[PDB]
Amino acid sequence: EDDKIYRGINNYQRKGPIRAPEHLRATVRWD
Amino acid sequence: VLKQNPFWWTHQRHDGKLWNLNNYRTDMIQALGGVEGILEHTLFKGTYFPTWEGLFWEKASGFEESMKWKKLTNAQRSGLNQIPNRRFTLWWSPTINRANVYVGFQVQLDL
Amino acid sequence: QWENSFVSVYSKDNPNLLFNMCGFECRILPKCRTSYEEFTHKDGVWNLQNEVTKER
Amino acid sequence: NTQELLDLLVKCENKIQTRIKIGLNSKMPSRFPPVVFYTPKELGGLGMLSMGHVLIPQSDLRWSKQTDVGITHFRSGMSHEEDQLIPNLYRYIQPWESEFIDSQRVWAEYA
Amino acid sequence: LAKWKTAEEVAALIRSLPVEEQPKQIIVTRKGMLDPLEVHLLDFPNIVIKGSELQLPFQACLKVEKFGDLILKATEPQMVLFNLYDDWLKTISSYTAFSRLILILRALHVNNDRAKVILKPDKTTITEPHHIWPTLTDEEWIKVEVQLKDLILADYGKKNNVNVASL
Amino acid sequence: MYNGIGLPTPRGSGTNGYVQRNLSLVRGRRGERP
Amino acid sequence: GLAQSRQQQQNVEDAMKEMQKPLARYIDDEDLDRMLREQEREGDPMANFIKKNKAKENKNKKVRPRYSGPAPPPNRFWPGYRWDGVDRSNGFEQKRFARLASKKAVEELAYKWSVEDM
Amino acid sequence: VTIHDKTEINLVSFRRTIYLAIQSSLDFEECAHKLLKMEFPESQTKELCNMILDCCAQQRTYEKFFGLLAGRFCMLKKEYMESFEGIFKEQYDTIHRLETNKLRNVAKMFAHLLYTDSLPWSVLECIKLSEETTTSSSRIFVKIFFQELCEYMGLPKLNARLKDETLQPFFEGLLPRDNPRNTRFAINFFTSIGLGGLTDELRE
RNA sequence: CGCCGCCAAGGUAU
Structure with missing residues (x-):
């Protein structure tokens, strides 16, 4: 209960930037 | 006149503003963070805007009393205006166009 | 006309006085015919008081 | 108190959400978030007022038509549960009886 | 020897903090530590050490009382972690916060007296214990900013006998 | 449906379901795990 | 005659706020919880228990007496009104007070007029 | 290698989302x-109950919703009533800071709890009726307090329950049968x- | 107890 070692910014108490599939190129088309 | 009024029971200059919703907007900001759109919208290629508090929106001829007395034949009179619907889509551009929800068919334009 | 009218009654058999008004309907339930009194401080519930004796 | 209108607001709010989604031809929760909606016009966006994130109540359906049972079995509203806590409008609107009890003493002290 | 004793604890701070929070660039004060930081940051090669022309009066941070009683009464290298942007990020950015903070710190550096009395303009300028700055409205925020930059310009014009309006 | 209620049409309304339990209830004995 | 007295008062308040008090004042402060107990705080039935009537003592900045209690017009700068100041003027205070109130009204309507189609 | 945090962002970041959960919903x-x-x-319970107090203290005109959430806790778990009462005794004995509004919202806040109970009837041992030692905003704190508690209980049902409880002499509010x-x-x-x-007549 | 995942004809005439 509030040990004030504080652990970093977001730790005071998978969404957002989602990980790209590493095993994939996006199928590109020339519009 | 055909505009249906949801305010048949009041008007402000005799019984007053019976509600002042002002802090709901501020608590919406504090619930979604003060950077609620800056991480999403490209403010960085807007200009070099470091402050984002002096930012101001559409003011140029919004009411448009007498435009210039042209004819306004069919579609430019009664049809909807396309430029707010495209500037709003331009405003949330990296989070209407994000690369990693459907990572399949992408269609780059010419040049 | 009968179909667009609405009659209701509070008596010894009906413990409740219900009526509609001006778009939204309400009802009076007295304190005297409650075995256990309702909570009456949590929602759209607001109480009525007698001004001659200050009690609800 | 009216549960059937709290259901109707949740039904129609997500319906106008979907109507704005089909204007972009996206219909996606992750590509097209509700961060786009709940942002004021002064910072940019559309600007709307939440009543779906109110956690609409339920009751025992066997005894709902029979007897006032109290309050049991909260039901979720919108499909947004990542703990952003978008506030409700009514918590920043002054109620009826508070306004009347304030108005009586305000006019009494004014006289 | 303090220039060599500092960089070891700085590198221990870099090792203690997580990966996304360690810096890519460090702007030090006047140069005596480019080669000690260069030989102490061998475990983290991608950190740039630069000495710029932006000196900042953190010695004026020793003039405030919550830092002053903490720096004078200590029996351990406690390594405390405080915050100077108290409640500004909810209303303004970090840009206006920095442009306010360095002006108030420079005003406290050149004259602690009138920069101390300016930050309490009335007798209703209370400060909550978890913050160090007072809580006041935006008009008197920019009013305090204007009178503290007037303090700094007046101290410059008194020191070097320079007309303030002629600059 | 744990005991009595749920939603017969999750595709009609703009919700997904998952009725919770009222943690603000007051009675004597309710637990089964301790 | 009194502006230098005001300068002396603000300098002695300046000295007591600088040479003895810290940079930030807290909630307690050993001064503010005294002032909060010494507030007016209207809505107090105990006012007539200790006070007889709103009498007129020698309540003045100097030793000399002060004008009585009718209502003088306001003049934007709260004065030392005494010795028979009975409401004679050309009408410049009321005109610019109405001007500044009208300015505060038309900025409110101008924000409305600007925010219409946004 | 270990930090200390003398910034409380663990506190205020907590106090934000119970300003928020109860802003939504x-x-x-x-x-x-x-x-x-x-x-x-x-x-954190003392701070929660204190935040439920605070948030209520600032809404324009008072909303009965807070002496209901507040009560729901205040009789739910044993702790909330204890912590919460502590907030009262703590509260009156200052009550000179906030005034003329928050003072009213908080006063009615407590009157509502007492009336709906879910709070021991002896919180009043702290209220010191003096007129030497009461000060102003204290005095019109307790004013709107009783005057506003008046009609809930009505005068008689208050008059009794104020006194009739026998064990009542915990307070200095009324019972100061001391010097004339x-x-x-x-x-x-x-x-x-x-x-x-x-x-009464204690003047013999 | 945990909905929902979108293409095209509709316009730059024959």
Whole structure:
């Protein structure tokens, strides 16, 4: 209960930037 | 006149503003963070805007009393205006166009 | 006309006085015919008081 | 108190959400978030007022038509549960009886 | 020897903090530590050490009382972690916060007296214990900013006998 | 449906379901795990 | 005659706020919880228990007496009104007070007029 | 290698989302639900109850919703009533800071709890009726307090429950049967506040 | 107790 070692910014108490599939190129088309 | 009024029971200059919703907007900001759109919208290629508090929106001829007395034949009179619907889509551009929800068919334009 | 009218009654058999008004309907339930009194401080519930004796 | 209108607001709010989604031809929760909606016009966006994130109540359906049972079995509203806590409008609107009890003493002290 | 004793604890701070929070660039004060930081940051090669022309009066941070009683009464290298942007990020950015903070710190550096009395303009300028700055409205925020930059310009014009309006 | 209620049409309304339990209830004995 | 007295008062308040008090004042402060107990705080039935009537003592900045209690017009700068100041003027205070109130009204309507189609 | 944090962002970041859970979520059954469901550890309970106090203190005109959420806790777990009462005794004995509004919202806040109970009837041992030692905003704190508690209980049902409880003599509010000063000052006060529902003759 | 995942004809005439 509030040990004030504080652990970093977001730790005071998978969404957002989602990980790209590493095993994939996006199928590109020339519009 | 055909505009249906949801305010048949009041008007402000005799019984007053019976509600002042002002802090709901501020608590919406504090619930979604003060950077609620800056991480999403490209403010960085807007200009070099470091402050984002002096930012101001559409003011140029919004009411448009007498435009210039042209004819306004069919579609430019009664049809909807396309430029707010495209500037709003331009405003949330990296989070209407994000690369990693459907990572399949992408269609780059010419040049 | 009968179909667009609405009659209701509070008596010894009906413990409740219900009526509609001006778009939204309400009802009076007295304190005297409650075995256990309702909570009456949590929602759209607001109480009525007698001004001659200050009690609800 | 009216549960059937709290259901109707949740039904129609997500319906106008979907109507704005089909204007972009996206219909996606992750590509097209509700961060786009709940942002004021002064910072940019559309600007709307939440009543779906109110956690609409339920009751025992066997005894709902029979007897006032109290309050049991909260039901979720919108499909947004990542703990952003978008506030409700009514918590920043002054109620009826508070306004009347304030108005009586305000006019009494004014006289 | 303090220039060599500092960089070891700085590198221990870099090792203690997580990966996304360690810096890519460090702007030090006047140069005596480019080669000690260069030989102490061998475990983290991608950190740039630069000495710029932006000196900042953190010695004026020793003039405030919550830092002053903490720096004078200590029996351990406690390594405390405080915050100077108290409640500004909810209303303004970090840009206006920095442009306010360095002006108030420079005003406290050149004259602690009138920069101390300016930050309490009335007798209703209370400060909550978890913050160090007072809580006041935006008009008197920019009013305090204007009178503290007037303090700094007046101290410059008194020191070097320079007309303030002629600059 | 744990005991009595749920939603017969999750595709009609703009919700997904998952009725919770009222943690603000007051009675004597309710637990089964301790 | 009194502006230098005001300068002396603000300098002695300046000295007591600088040479003895810290940079930030807290909630307690050993001064503010005294002032909060010494507030007016209207809505107090105990006012007539200790006070007889709103009498007129020698309540003045100097030793000399002060004008009585009718209502003088306001003049934007709260004065030392005494010795028979009975409401004679050309009408410049009321005109610019109405001007500044009208300015505060038309900025409110101008924000409305600007925010219409946004 | 280890830090200390003398910035409390663990506190205020907590105090933000119970300003928020109860900003969202209409009525009081849902606010309590959401608050429970966040499993707040016990250390923080004094601060939670204090934040429920605070948030209520600032809404324009008072909303009965807070003496309902507040009560729902205040009789739910044993702790909330204890912590919460501590907030009262703590509260009156300052009450000179906030004034003329928050003072009213908080006063009615407590009157509402007492009336709906879910709070021991002896919180009043701290209220010191003096007229020497009461100060202003204290005095019109307790004014709107009783005067506003008046009609809920009505005068008689208050008059009794104030006194009839036998064990009542925990307080200095009314019972100061002491020197003919603060005794006379009680009578005068409650007659001025316009209740006079209890006045006696101790003057022999 | 945990909905929902979108293409095209509709316009730059024959």
